[PDB]
Specification:
The structure is cut from a larger assembly and holds 4 copies of chain A (359 residues).
Chain A: E1 3-8, E2 11-16, H1 17-20, E3 38-39, E4 44-47, H2 54-63, H3 75-85, H4 89-99, H5 114-122, H6 129-152, H7 163-181, H8 187-190, H9 194-197, H10 204-213, H11 216-224, H12 238-248, H13 251-276, H14 291-298, H15 311-326, H16 333-347
PDB class: membrane protein
Keywords: potassium channel, complex, membrane protein
Entry title: human voltage-gated potassium channel KV1.3
């Protein structure tokens, strides 16, 4: 009912007493903690603290829980004022998701001594010595395997000695498969994180080769999954994580690029067909034939096998070359801004934020 | 004449009384509403409200109606303060066009039960069940029709069976034509929204084929309007609306791109002509011939049929390749900023704004 | 010596009296103008004006003349407060060059009635009726002339009838030359504005043809100045003015682009020479020969006449293709930001600024 | 224990006295300097200074040394207030590294009269007359030498007269080598600055030619270091310094570009191999052969020697052309922002900052 006066180093704030009695745990809401800040000659509380920061602390009492931050006060100064006014760890955690820095995820443990030794030994290569030694050999097994796959597709050998070279890798592809299937917090959550479901498609398509030798169009595609062994490098590369979430945060913005271009692939190929169908020398036999000419011009690749020849086709091709810029440059800066939003918060993100946030 | 003191939680404001008597309907302007906020021991009115928000509410009384917003206070907080001070729905609507979020347009009704059932059934596919079922079939009729037009221009059949395939579509192009011509709020405003005038050019150029078979250069162009059937997909695509307004907001900024390039198409073709006219092997027969070489180089497409050969032409072509970047990259970022201005206010625009604006 | 208190609607400011006595013409500095704002019950001056705007007006008295503007207060509100406090037209003009909007240039007059009629008739086409009629015919004379120059270089006529076509233009190129040489504020300043010195190079190189027919390498270049007739279109085009100042504000930033690329033209051509000199089939005869290959790859034009063939040249050409992006994309966004700085202040610039600035 | 009141032109600040007694050298902390600002009728100190600037000066006393700056107050105004309040040269230097402008590096001297004359004569060409005359001749020695190296690789002379032309340069490459080796502050720090270690690789690879004439694959590469003579131009070019630090500040961001592309060079070449291996006419013999096709398409260079022919390869090449944009445009704007961060602070950087910072 009655009101209180709070004097933050010369700046006067006046709220009713019952507003501070919403949160009877904090500094301002507990009548025995603030009694050493009272000033009986002026009937007010004097804090020699930051001036522009208390305007946000007062709003947390009035709004009932919303923690904002003014532009002037930095992160390392506003975080101390939450610690000084004792707003609580629920109030402190609201400064996380307001700012954008997400909390750390607690990892489950296999509640033993054997499986708790080997879980932190391979999943967390920064733990121990051979944990750093298991990472420096896990980069080789994929890197040799992508090279011999590049070496198997060489025309010197295609036009079994390499079988002892590849089985040197797949048993190591089983060696990290076997020791990780059963050492996990739960087999359920081991089948959720996509970084290992993709790895078992490096052991199945080699295994289907053995059952088939001991349907020819299938035999090409089951060696095509041997190009997916380059996706295992995302385990030991921080950059592909940032590229990984960039597409993962732009499922829709990529589909708007493909749809925006595909109208022009229909439109300009049909426009150059109806201006170059009157020529026995013109290569444009069909609109299905002229689909390749469109996507090369709008991407400004410009091969030079296909050529418009009449004057009506060259003005069609001129407007196709201009509109390829505008049908590409519009959706893509939201993909650069999505990438930098993830690039910032991984290499320089939690080095200033969480250093003075959690405490 | 006399002045009043308003105390917004410790911050004192003092205006004359006649300034509050400009708007004798609101909270501060009505002498029986504010009488429960008076403080007879200090001769002032005490509000325990947001501090930096009242600086904008006070300016609305002084300026006579202008509603601004400080940078600090968000949209969801400044909107409550207009609701608390009871500034009025005309004052609340000024927070719309100041912020930029435009009001919703009221749609007219055909004041019946038959035509009011069928107006909301096809124009508003989110209304009912078969309203969502009429949209999933309206995407097929255009999509098959663009495919058979691509299939009619195949060279396997050109070098009537397809007539029963296309008339399967045009009667459906009449089926959405017929039921929408007469079910409308007014036939006048049905002929204003361009999304249906373009649709009737998918029934007229097929109809001119029938009168002509039952002038050869006209027969090509009346099949050229069968490429305009891809423009009907903007009815069931939110993305082409955003691309649609992007060109619609940059009629002038596109014409500055075409004019800026076209000076270089004249200039560099004339410069490479006067350095390569001294060669019987040079392909550059004319400045009308060298127009095609210019627009390919400045767009960095680079076909490779045309080749400058002398040393004087290669330095001309070098400056043509550099200046193609600067004659393209300058006008286009105002077209990316116009696109993102419409991209933001359609998918994430009214999800934070109007959720706490209208009330 | 003594101090004054100024109360801007509840906010108290206190300066010494001698600070207001620096500028004894304004409202606060003149002791008979502010005497109707005095408040003898509080010993202060009460203004019911804008609160955050007076913090900048007070700094103008303390600093001795510097007029700033806070971020919060707009242009149309801060301009009224200078008008209300009567700071003066010298103080008002300091709000121009602080904000960036330059003053209008006063044009000189030929102090007569004949020459003052004809000066505003052609230089200012927005003056009268035929002033708009002289602009619609001044666009034709250059546009026909650029076409017949394009038509003279046609190979149908080169491989005198066109002389009566071109002299139809050059006498009109004399008709705007003659009536503007002598109608001017001064013949001195008529020879300074570059928009007419360039026009007289459309009458001299045609005139040298007549003295020579009534040295063959000169005869080509004196028809090469007939491509400079496209530069006269900047008189009746607002866009080329903005492009004109963009290069005119980036003399240095263009030279940093040409120098940055030219290191790569030396470097990669020498690197591909030393990896492809071991081949009788390689086209790269010299580093002067491989200069053309470098500038085509780094600009991503990619003709396709020149081809690296050995494996050592393809890895050289791969790094040449990547580094062409970084040797182009770095200097150019300061040229887009210079263009938009001039694009904004010509079509939408003085429509909000000077509408409430000068008064 | 007791508190003081400071009145910055109407704005009241109140801190305890012991907070000002942390820094007993400044104006507020020294009880004989502030005694002429006291006001015995109000028991406070009155300063007629800038209002929003003292909120940052007060925080320097409370935080114990941190000097911030509000957004409102400029650099030339906040710097005067540090000078007026006498915060000290250690406090003044904290305004440097907070703002970002680094201090000037003191150069060592050879403590003589001979070597101190010649150190400032060549390293500092802005010192004297012939110091500007030694720079205008130091640009020629490298520029002729890069030309005769371009002239030695001409095919008119390769398919000794030029030896007296090149030794005219290398003795001048010794003339700036000899006079700078021994005139330095220390021979240790002369071997640290990379701008001269690179210069001595313009005298060693010519010297190995003399020992070998008075191993053929070495003879090519020791003339390949004669392309490194273009790197000496960074001594007399301010622009290459800014490009020099741009790569020097993006060692990691360049490696993320090469790694991001190289996944696509593996992926799409393997995808176009498995769709074009079924053709005797297809040029794609191997994935090592198709590596060149990938990096040309993703960079949108598009030579035109290699051509996908089947329909399955053209849809593979279409997605390769699109994804080349997204595998290039993502890392590069952090390299444009790193370049402009160095471009700003060298030509317009210390012209506003240090003009009113150091004093």
């Amino acid at each position: 009912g009655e009101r209180v006066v709070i004097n933050i180093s010369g700046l006067r704030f006046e709220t009713q007493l019952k507003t501070l009695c919403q949160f009877p745990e904090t500094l301002l809401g507990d009548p025995k903690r603030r009694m050493r800040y009272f000033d009986p000659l002026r009937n007010e509380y004097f804090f020699d603290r930051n001036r522009p920061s208390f305007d946000a602390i007062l709003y947390y009492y009035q709004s009932g829980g919303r923690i904002r931050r003014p532009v002037n006060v930095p992160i390392d100064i506003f975080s101390e004022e939450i610690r000084f006014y004792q707003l609580g760890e629920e109030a402190m955690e609201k400064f996380r998701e307001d700012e954008g820095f997400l909390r750390e995820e607690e990892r489950p443990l296999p509640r033993r001594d054997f499986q708790r030794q080997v879980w932190l030994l391979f999943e967390y290569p920064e733990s121990s010595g051979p944990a750093r030694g298991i990472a420096i050999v896990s980069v080789l097994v994929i890197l040799i395997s992508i090279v011999i796959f590049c070496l198997e597709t060489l025309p010197e050998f295609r036009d079994d000695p390499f079988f002892v070279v590849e089985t040197l890798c797949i048993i190591w592809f089983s060696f990290e498969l076997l020791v990780r299937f059963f050492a996990c917090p739960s087999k359920a959550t081991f089948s959720r994180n996509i970084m290992n479901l993709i790895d078992i498609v490096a052991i199945i398509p080699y295994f289907i080769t053995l059952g088939t030798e001991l349907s020819l169009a299938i035999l090409r595609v089951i060696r095509l999954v041997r190009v997916f062994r380059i996706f295992k490098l995302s385990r030991h590369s921080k950059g592909l994580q940032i590229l990984g979430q960039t597409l993962k945060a732009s499922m829709r913005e990529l589909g708007l690029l493909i749809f925006f271009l595909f109208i022009g692939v229909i439109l300009f190929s049909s426009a150059v067909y109806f201006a170059e169908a009157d020529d026995p020398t013109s290569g444009f036999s069909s609109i299905p034939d002229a689909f390749w000419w469109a996507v090369v011009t709008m991407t400004t690749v410009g091969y030079g096998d296909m050529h418009p020849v009449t004057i009506g086709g060259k003005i069609v091709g001129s407007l196709c070359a201009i509109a390829g810029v505008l049908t590409i440059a519009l959706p893509v800066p939201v993909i650069v801004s999505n990438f930098n939003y993830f690039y910032h918060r991984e290499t320089e993100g939690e080095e200033q934020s969480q250093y003075m946030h959690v405490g």
